[PDB]
Every structure is written in structure tokens, then in C-alpha cells.
Write a protein that binds this ligand. Structure first.
Ligand code: HEM
Ligand SMILES: [Ca+2]
Ligand SMILES: [Ca+2]
Length: 329
């Protein structure tokens, strides 16, 4: 089918997303960049979608965290999300697109901007959010492994799928975990969607990067990098440890797992039999940049091996002296 602007797609109904695509790339994504806004817009996909439970309710990927900001941005777990929410709300208002449809679209376009990224299946047609998400639905970085997995599981996710989605932390920084140090990335390459997250969190912690005593934070191996308590533990918990380790220097799996597990999440509360497939609009991602490595000044001896069945893949290390990670602009 042929859209007005000459660009083409499978379902002609998907032609509404083209100008929307161009606007987000220009006016939300700084000129289609893998920077701050993409990271927080991707986090938003999770925060909207995970508001879903067979027991407690919630509409999942329904766009509620926008239409009900005043209720949901006041969730402790939703701390610091009000930004991107206020940042996105003008577009949802402006464009012929529902709130739920916009969040998952933006997250999908954002990831396509990151080198090493993957095209995420996007479905158009989510109806308007009917009520606010309930609380206790977004997990927090100080929740135990069991609480986190039970929560994701209740929403529809196996332990292995949790690990796959946490590949998002490879293009991710924290603002409210340690507020003394905002824009502090979860690994050394927040502009590049790669395996450096799963690698560097397996490292033995060395230091607190900002202030010593923050809830949900543990020691990090790198000045300029923050490690979540939840990520620290998942990488060392027998339920998730071997899978975590399998993402190391395994880009295609990272991309593939993430692409499929995200479409599922972007569908929580939704039926894709009643949605239109507009996946062929999501841009082609830039190629991966750099290779998987230990950080400079590290060896295999600095890795805390947590997988009982398979030992940590021996990687090389950056040369020169040990350094620090620039915070996210
Ligand atoms: C499963 C348990 C999870 C926990 C405990 C957790 C926790 C966190 C925390 C505390 C932050 C930093 C917020 C702050 O600034 O204080 C963060 C950032 C982020 N999260 Fe997660 N998260 C989880 C899962 C996910 C999932 C499923 C996604 C899927 C997209 C995701 C995507 C992101 C992204 C992209 C950021 C970076 C935000 C930015 O740099 O603007 N996370 N996470
Ligand atoms: Ca919701
Ligand atoms: Ca990275």
C-alpha cells in the first residue's frame, strides 16, 4: 500500500504513523538519537505495560500512565517518570494516536535509533485507557528476586523473559536511585544497545559512585556507573544467573529475545487479533558498535561467576589505564 508521502507499507491503515514517526525523531529524539529521551521513553513502555495483573487489575499497555499521570506519576515506583510523560503528552494530544499506541511506538522507534538495536514488532489499534493502573504493579530495585519474578510472572513473564527485557538496562541511566548523581548509566555504553550490561554487572562491585547510602543501590565496579540491587542479584540468583550470563557477547540472542519479549509486553491487556500489524514502519537500527569486553584494568578474576552449569565467557579487556563512565547528557 502507498501512503500520501510516497512511503510504503503492508497495511495502508499504518500510514498514520509516518508523520508521527518523523515528529518524534525530530522533536522528542533530538534528531533520532540514542540519548536521554529514548531511554526514558523506553522505560515508559515498561511502566505503562506492567500495570497489569489477573488478580489486582490494571489495563497493561493501555496508555494509562499518561491519561492518569496525576494518579500514576505519584507512584513511588514511578518516581522521575513525570518528565517523559509531560514530554510525550503533547504528541498524543496532537496526533491521531491513542496513548497506549504512542508509548509502545515511541519505545520501538527509540530502540531503532540505538546502534546494536533491533526492530520491535509494533501493533496499531490500542483503545483508550479506561482507568488508572493500580499500585504495587511496578517492581522496585530493592524488591527481592522472588518478589520481582513473582510480580513479572503474575503479569505473564517467565524468569528467562525478565532477563531478556533487562537488556533495556544496556541503554539506560538512573536519576532517582542516587539523586546526587543523575544521568548515571547502568553500563559503560548507554548509547549502544549491547551486552556490556550483562558483563559489567557480573563484575565484583568496587565502589559507590555518588552517595554511599541509597535504597536499591549496591556497589558498582566503575566510577560513573551505578548498579541496581535488583540487577546485582538477578545476575547472581540461580533462577536467572545462567541466562544472564548467556547474553554476554551474544548479540543476536539479545536482539531476538528483546524484540519478541517487548512485543509481548507492549501487548499486555491487549489482543493482537484486534490490532493491526504496523511492524514494517519501525526504522532499521544502526549496526552494533565495538566488541564485548571486560572494562580496562579488569581480568576474568574480577568476575563473580554465578552460573553453575556454564563458566563465564572469557573476553578481552580495553587497553590503557582504568577509567570512568561519562554520565548521560
Ligand atoms: C524487572 C525489574 C526492574 C527494575 C527493578 C527496574 C528498575 C529501574 C530503575 C530504578 C531505573 C532508574 C530510575 C531512576 O532514574 O531512578 C531504571 C531505568 C530504566 N529502565 Fe528498568 N527496571 C526493571 C525492568 C525494566 C524493564 C522490563 C524495562 C523495559 C523497557 C526497563 C527499562 C528501563 C530503561 C530504558 C531505563 C533508563 C531510564 C533513563 O535512562 O531515562 N526496565 N530501571
Ligand atoms: Ca496500565
Ligand atoms: Ca550498553
Amino acid at each position: 500500500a502507498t501512503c500520501a508521502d510516497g512511503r510504503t507499507t503492508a497495511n495502508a491503515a499504518c500510514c498514520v504513523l509516518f508523520p508521527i514517526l518523523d515528529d518524534i525523531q525530530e522533536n522528542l529524539f533530538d534528531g533520532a538519537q540514542c540519548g536521554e529521551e529514548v531511554h526514558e521513553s523506553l522505560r515508559l513502555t515498561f511502566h505503562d505495560a506492567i500495570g497489569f495483573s489477573p488478580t489486582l487489575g490494571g489495563g497493561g499497555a493501555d496508555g494509562s500512565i499518561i491519561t492518569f499521570d496525576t494518579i500514576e506519576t505519584n507512584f513511588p515506583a514511578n518516581a522521575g517518570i513525570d518528565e517523559i510523560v509531560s514530554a510525550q503528552k503533547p504528541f498524543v494530544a496532537k496526533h491521531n494516536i491513542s496513548a497506549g499506541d504512542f508509548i509502545q511506538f515511541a519505545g520501538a522507534v527509540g530502540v531503532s535509533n540505538c546502534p546494536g538495536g533491533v526492530r520491535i514488532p509494533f501493533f496499531l489499534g490500542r483503545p483508550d485507557a479506561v482507568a488508572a493502573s493500580p499500585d504495587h504493579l511496578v517492581p522496585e530495585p530493592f524488591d527481592s528476586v522472588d518478589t520481582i519474578l513473582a510480580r513479572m510472572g503474575d503479569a505473564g513473564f517467565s524468569a528467562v523473559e525478565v532477563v531478556w527485557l533487562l537488556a533495556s538496562h544496556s541503554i539506560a541511566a538512573a536519576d532517582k536511585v542516587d539523586p546526587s548523581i543523575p544521568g548515571t548509566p547502568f553500563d559503560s555504553t548507554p548509547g549502544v544497545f549491547d551486552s556490556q550490561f550483562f558483563i559489567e554487572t557480573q563484575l565484583k562491585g568496587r565502589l559507590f559512585p555518588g552517595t554511599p547510602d541509597n535504597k536499591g543501590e549496591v556497589q558498582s565496579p566503575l566510577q560513573g556507573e551505578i548498579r541496581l540491587q535488583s540487577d546485582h542479584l538477578l545476575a547472581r540468583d540461580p533462577q536467572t544467573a545462567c541466562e544472564w550470563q548467556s547474553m554476554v557477547n551474544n548479540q543476536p540472542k539479545i536482539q531476538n529475545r528483546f524484540a519478541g519479549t517487548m512485543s509481548k509486553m507492549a501487548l499486555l491487556g491487549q489482543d493482537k487479533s484486534k490490532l493491526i500489524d504496523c511492524s514494517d514502519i519501525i526504522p532499521t537500527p544502526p549496526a552494533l558498535v565495538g566488541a564485548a569486553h571486560l572494562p580496562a584494568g579488569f581480568s576474568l578474576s574480577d568476575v563473580e561467576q554465578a552460573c553453575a552449569e556454564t563458566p563465564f565467557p572469557a573476553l578481552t579487556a580495553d587497553p590503557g589505564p582504568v577509567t570512568s563512565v561519562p554520565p548521560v547528557p
